[PDB]
Design a protein around this ligand. Structure first.
Ligand SMILES: [Mg+2]
Ligand SMILES: [Mg+2]
Ligand SMILES: [Mg+2]
Lengths: 332, 336
């Protein structure tokens, strides 16, 4: 099988240091299933994971494809199944013709949309579900979330786009931020109830528009810039979280006056730590599938590139690092 | 008129006993306020920190733990009658308990337990409300014992005021509690409070977990020197776990250290509810009432270990010195 990888970490200005590789096709460990890949997505993380040492390295943490084979302990899937998933950065990525993945991290993909559209959803969707249900602790019952408001700083990114949809489906009011006609229209398309401009004072906008302090705040870009804003905008005893690493250390005492909680969401904590509850990833992907088939969620692919090649993956990293509305996808 | 102990400007204890005795009018309670004739008070770390704040209008009167008898009530109070024996903590934005009388909103008060003395009961309001918020609000433990069984709390520095009562609460609600203590006095005391396992925070905590076969914990909170133990709390908590402090950091911290295990970090502040006049201020009443019920059932024990007799400037000063020394086990009380 073919794969795109690298031997050492690099910045793009170093040059295109992706190379092709020819590997075997293994058999699936007992709870593993083996997947022939149809399409993949590129995520901020691939650009971040490209900088780490190499213990080649093969990136890719979004995939959809057809189940080639499964292991003797598999009860969840069959050869033939069209499945999508994210996986984990300590196993070779989806940047390959074939890929091994544990069954508990996978779900059948929706069939009422194209493969290239459905593959916009696994990494971003799992991340958003973990943020809403595990971190913030919203109810699976829509009525129990009545009166709750979520603020998403940067609604137009991959996680922002799907989290908006999920939060709406589960009964929340969703406020997002977007600062140009293109990102404003997109977040509105995703279901935002109120759109604010993150390049101008947010608290001012809350005051102007009569917006009360929010239950939960979720930052998806430049958290250093918005740490104090998140604290100002959340209600006492509320909860703020990020999915973007900070560039600098912060004052945790700033959380004291309102007795706040701060969470750093990382969707790979479950697989990386082989947690008892890795199955939640399957459960979240399955809910996504159901809601896509119901037309409650819509996919978020806006750019498609054809061919899993070193020139392509490099271009995709150039694009991700420019900081995209919705998702970038590559078809094999 | 009423005697109150207070001060005109923030000061260090090295500046001497600048507490002063004031003669003040006895207030009348507003609609939902009660007027309490104070019997006993406790002195807490927060007293010593608040003694460093600018005084907006003189004098500043501290004191954030009280028990006494209801003298009167505002005209829509329904939760209490004249004569009721009640206890509470209150809030730093109003005159505190270092006085013969005090006003407090009814939603922040509960009747005290009847089976222990006033000097024992007053050890409980501030530490207990802080422990209930940490466990129920911050960590989100269940009111249902079964939902908590199989879970473990670690308390770093377990023998202080909040650590003492939290150990009891957590045990009552079904958790395993691991505490840390590093000298004979504190080890014995935390065991007496109910700790299942006691570890030494002067030695590698992770090495103690490995060698004793301790699984990573569900919840960690730190009651002293959080800068020193931040990285430890991250090491010892389970993936997607929750860590918290009730004391301020000296230094900024790397919040990316929370990322690998997708962790939550909370800074618990007991006064956030009254200071923001939150809609759910009644939780303070609710937690104080649960403490009273469990004391009367002999499930919780009071934590007073030192008593000073007399509300005087000398005694308040001596209490501040004792608290600043960070050597107290359990609680220090002053009887009026
Ligand atoms: Mg299932
Ligand atoms: Mg929670
Ligand atoms: Mg009641």
């Amino acid at each position: 099988l073919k794969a795109i990888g690298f031997e050492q970490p690099f910045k793009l200005s170093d040059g295109n240091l992706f190379k092709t590789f020819n590997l075997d096709i293994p058999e699936p460990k007992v709870h593993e299933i083996l997947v022939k890949i149809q399409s993949i997505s590129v995520n901020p993380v691939d650009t971040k994971q490209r900088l780490m040492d190499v213990s080649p390295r093969v990136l890719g943490f979004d995939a959809i494809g057809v189940v080639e084979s499964v292991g003797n302990e598999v009860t969840m899937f069959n050869q033939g199944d069209i499945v999508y998933y994210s996986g984990s950065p300590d196993q070779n990525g989806s940047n390959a013709e074939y890929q091994l993945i544990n069954e508990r991290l996978v779900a059948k993909a929706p069939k009422n949309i194209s493969a290239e559209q459905a593959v916009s959803l696994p990494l971003t969707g799992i991340t958003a579900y973990e943020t809403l249900f595990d971190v913030f602790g919203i109810s699976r019952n829509r009525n129990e979330n009545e009166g709750k408001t979520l603020l998403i700083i940067n609604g137009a990114g991959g996680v922002g786009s799907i989290a908006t949809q999920i939060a709406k489906a589960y009964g929340l009011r969703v406020i997002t931020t977007a600062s140009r006609n293109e990102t404003i229209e997109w977040t509105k398309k995703m279901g935002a109830d109120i759109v604010l401009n993150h390049k101008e004072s947010l608290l001012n906008q809350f005051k102007t528009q009569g917006i009360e302090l929010v239950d939960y705040v979720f930052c998806t870009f430049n958290t250093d810039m918005y740490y104090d804003d998140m604290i100002q905008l959340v209600k006492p005893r509320g909860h703020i979280a990020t999915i973007v690493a900070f560039e600098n250390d912060q004052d945790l005492n700033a959380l004291k006056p309102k007795s706040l909680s701060f969470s750093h969401e990382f969707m790979f904590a479950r697989p990386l730590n082989q947690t008892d509850d890795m199955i939640k990833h399957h459960e979240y992907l399955e809910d996504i599938t159901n809601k896509v088939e119901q037309n409650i969620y819509q996919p978020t692919t806006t750019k498609v590139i054809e061919g899993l090649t070193t020139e392509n993956i490099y271009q995709a990293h150039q694009i991700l690092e420019s900081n995209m509305i919705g998702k970038l996808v590559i078809n094999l």
